[PDB]
């Protein structure tokens, strides 16, 4: 039996003496490993609950924790696609089971001083390939997430997406020095300027010959806070604020593998934001792209400023024309508190685009909610000396900060903003398929609803 | 011209030039008074915006504005109703001209050592009638909260509710001392033992001759923290904790004014959360009137260990069948990091009664946001010892608060939970048809909820 | 002996564990009495006046401020078969006082009897091992509560030896 076989039960299945002897009842993610029948090989039972309530999570979950009981084995085999009863048809399963297994599998070792096969048992050969694909791109978002930031500095970080784009036949743009102030894109130029490694800005172009989705990616590298330095004696995961800029990166490399028919340009700004002698001040005022100031009144609401030029070149009339622009970002601390640590915030006018985001995320497993953009809270953006503020020292910061955004979409084009700062980055230990650190959480949402648009 | 009339105006409609003179240009709210034609009175030119964007919030905000332009005068007439040309019927501009007449006039003047008449000229009378009375019950709300503690003690309280209920033709049951211990209220007993104020629970029923909704009110009269107590140097509205009582008393003593054919039940839990020699103690277990247990890990986490058992025993099943519960509850402080001072949090399961609740609170101009009941923020409910916490220390307190109260709802039985710690005080200056201070928030929206419900 | 050794520190697990709203300083003699009769333990426990007899100054001054008031027990082990002197700090919810634990910061304030508890349970499992010494136990109980009536910050305690 190939080393391990991994078959799934759900409740009431028949396993053996010994199983049941052991306490396998079934639930969720549970694993109970015997002997073959023939002696030779190991047997996974792994729970897959009632079959009546079972989604595609519990496939996706049950395969990650049939990975983390392997052993010193050199081969494995998920049978868990196999298993049926439940409401989740056959591709799906095949799909979540492939997906499960690598980012179960997933480890981060590159910094530290036997398993050989694993194998989807399943005539969903398409589906199968999805989910590694898919998968992969998670784990690229991972990795990226994950690397210290003294090595993926925004020229690192620049350098790394070349390649990627190189690999997968994407075209790439990328903006620095000289060429960079071309582009007028003032808030990522003085966010960027305290720090030693200088700003860059990247463009992705995924364009085959089969509408104009924009991706838009908050890639600040390392966040110390600014001048408006972070507490020393709290934690704060500062290499993790490249987190969006990882998900589109790692959702445009999917997308040659998908074939999928529309076109899809990633807008990167990368920038380190540090305390020095020439870093940004507390009531600098930037002067944008569109013209409209922005006073900072603290440097540590750094990201949206840094966004707004990005959102303004993706979105304004001219060649080609972008039809629609999506906003990934690691944005806010405050959302957090209400929402907790493993969900999303989703925020835009368009209803229709919010139901096929959230569907995607659905599909994708990955939690987010719709939050409202409150009239009342522009107030809350206002400035005695600019046109508006980053900050407002004031509850509604999350809210705020998609009002921020939504000041430099072009009139007319739909527009989504994802905040994803705590479910970018788990602080607690691993669970299900998702490890501790860099989760990579959004490239598969963004996938799903690209193939959605797609449609 | 009744010393003073109130004439609304939308952008575009003539003005003399004396109006113009002074810049009025239709602006929602915007007022610039001028002598009559006949130069014996006052005129109040009140600005509408735009007619086709003009919603029943602008008249509701434009009478605000009008009362609080009045100066010295004995009587004013509202013509505000009258301006057509937006979508806003006859009928709903009248409602909403008379409740942003009656909310822009409130003051809370009990504690400090001429206008005569407001008319409301319409042919609508029926809804300039239910406008008063909606409004004059959140000016109740709005007295019992700005209510100093030392007055508005748990019995004082409950002896309100009493008179109120006479009134009203309200049924109303006061328990205290032994009587309320026979009930099994451990959770509000336990929180209540440290004041020298001792707790009440109160049940008001409006039962007219013509589905029966359950209406829980959280009403600590004065949240102190504990023994996990408050820290001083940080300001808190620690006597408007019972924001979520008022709420209800308030609703409920204007159903007979409306003669709605359904029969409400208010439950109210009444107590003081004070640090004391005899105070409930972090790592208490508290049992339930369902025989589940919570550990108190945080005093300052009172409210939901209040209304565990009270949404115990109004859902229960037994004598007429409480069809469908609703709580009210200043319950939460995390929630405005996200969501900002003027929006409340709505929790329920049941997706048509979240629509229900959304478009009443639209049609009452207040302002909430759907959350989810996540289903991974459970694991943060886990205790050692008890079957629960009341407080996780961790992130997702809004949820995690709003899933303990759903442990404690019979099975079956639609809930919702409304969250309205922020908007229910409002601790920045007046605007619009708001006060500084207690605002009387969800009163209104209750009312048009029940309303919905009753049809 | 691995046995009776363990069952001992799981007894002192339970009574560390308790809510302290259930093991207050009056229910702790209670439970601390039980305890020495099963064993054969001589016990006496102090309270009220007979408390205030024995000059425990500390005791009655940290204890005052809360609503359950503070006991004082003696257990000895004296078999037939050196007098060895065994004392427990039992403050059954130590919040601190006027000088309150901030509250946001997380503390097993119920646990603050773990002393206690370490005597109490090392003392019952004396009898079973039938060691040739004699070993009494000194429990002073209480909770550390804020009050109209709490110790201050300031106050001076005069000691049973007459010191301050
Ligand atoms: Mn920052
Ligand atoms: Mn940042
Ligand atoms: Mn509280
Ligand atoms: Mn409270």
Not at 170 to 191: M, Q, R
Not at 342 to 364: I, Y
Not at 371 to 390: F, T, Y
Request: charged share 20%; net charge negative; proline share 6%.
């Amino acid at each position: 039996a190939a080393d391990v076989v991994a078959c799934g039960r759900h409740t009431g299945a028949a396993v053996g003496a010994f199983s049941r002897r052991r306490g396998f009842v079934a639930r969720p993610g549970q694993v109970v490993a015997e002997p073959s029948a023939d002696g030779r090989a190991v047997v996974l039972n792994v729970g897959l609950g009632p079959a009546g309530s079972a989604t595609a999570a519990t496939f996706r979950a049950a395969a990650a924790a049939s990975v983390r009981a392997v052993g010193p084995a050199r081969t494995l085999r998920l049978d868990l696609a196999l298993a049926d009863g439940s409401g989740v048809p056959a591709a799906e399963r095949a799909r979540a089971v492939a997906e499960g297994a690598v980012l179960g599998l997933y480890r981060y070792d590159e910094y530290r001083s036997p398993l050989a096969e694993v194998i989807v048992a399943t005539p969903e050969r398409r589906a199968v390939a999805e989910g590694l694909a898919a998968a992969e791109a998670t784990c690229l978002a991972r990795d990226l997430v994950n690397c210290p930031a003294g090595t993926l500095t925004p020229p690192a970080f620049a350098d790394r997406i070349r390649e990627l784009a190189h690999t997968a036949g994407l075209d790439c743009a990328v903006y620095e020095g000289a060429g960079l102030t071309e582009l007028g894109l003032t808030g990522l130029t003085a966010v960027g300027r305290g720090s030693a490694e200088p700003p860059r800005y990247v463009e992705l172009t995924y364009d085959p010959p089969d509408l104009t989705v924009g991706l838009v990616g908050k890639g600040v590298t390392f966040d110390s806070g600014g001048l408006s330095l972070k507490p020393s004696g709290e934690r704060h995961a500062m290499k993790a604020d490249m987190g969006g800029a990882a998900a589109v990166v790692a959702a445009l490399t999917a997308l040659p593998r998908l074939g999928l028919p529309l076109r899809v340009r990633g807008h990167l700004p990368l920038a380190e934001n540090m305390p020095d002698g020439g870093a940004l001040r507390v009531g600098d005022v930037v002067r944008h792209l569109d013209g409209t100031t922005t006073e900072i009144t603290h440097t540590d609401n750094e990201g949206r400023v840094v966004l707004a030029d990005v959102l303004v070149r993706a979105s304004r009339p001219g060649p080609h024309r972008s039809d629609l622009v999506v906003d990934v970002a690691t944005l806010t601390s405050a959302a957090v508190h209400a929402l907790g640590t493993r969900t999303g915030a989703l925020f835009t006018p368009d209803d229709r685009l919010a139901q096929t985001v959230l569907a995607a995320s659905e599909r994708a497993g990955e939690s987010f909610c719709r939050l409202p953009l409150l009239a009342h809270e522009r107030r809350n953006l206002r400035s005695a000396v600019a046109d508006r503020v980053n900050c407002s020292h004031r509850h509604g910061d999350t809210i705020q900060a998609a009002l921020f955004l939504q000041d430099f979409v072009a009139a007319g084009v739909p527009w989504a903003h994802l905040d994803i700062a705590a479910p970018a980055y788990n602080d607690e230990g691993p669970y299900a398929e998702v490890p501790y650190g860099g989760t990579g959480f959004a490239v598969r949402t963004l996938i799903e609803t690209l193939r959605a648009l797609s449609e």
